[PDB]
Structure formats: structure tokens, C-alpha cells
Amino acid sequence: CGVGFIAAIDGKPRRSVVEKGIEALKAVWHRGAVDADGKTGDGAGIHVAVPQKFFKDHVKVIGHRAPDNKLAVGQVFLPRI
């Protein structure tokens, strides 16, 4: 178990932010619940800023025209059965 955050003071979006976030997540296993099957966790999550360039390049590859303002994305969990 554990909570943490990383912030750039000036306001640079940069890769080292996500680098250090993932590195921090990779160093918490000692507090978590040690389990037998080795695969079932108890819940984990990360929260970051939306990479406009990624989704804009994706939409371009689809064939649309990338807008100028900020694009929005939503993540959904739908039924599976």
C-alpha cells in the first residue's frame, strides 16, 4: 500500500515525470499483500496528463483533421459477457 505524487514546478510536460512515477510504483511491493498465486493484486492506479500529440496522431492516421484546441478522451469499462 502507498500513495505518492510527482510534480514539475515550472510547468514542463516531460518524460521523466512518468519515468519516476513508474519507478516509484515499482518499489512498493514490500508493503503490499504477499500472495500465493503471484498474479492477483489488490488494486493499483496511476493518474497523468493527457498526451494530446498521441491522440492527434492517432486521429490523423484514421484520416480526420486534427483540431487546434485540446482534444478530450474518456476511458470506459463496459460489460464483457
Footprint on this chain of a second copy (rule: CB under 8 A) = 61-65, 81
Instruction: Provide the H-helix boundaries in the chain.
Output: 15-25, 52-62
Q: Which three cell numbers mark 18?
A: 512518468
- Minimum separation from the CB atom of position 20 to a second copy (A): 29
Distance CA 66, CA 52 (A): 10
> What's at 35, amino acid-wise?
D
Residue with Cβ nearer a second copy (19 or 57) = 57
Is 1 noted as a catalytic residue in this protein?
A: yes
- Minimum separation from the CB atom of position 72 to a second copy (A): 18
Active site residues: 1
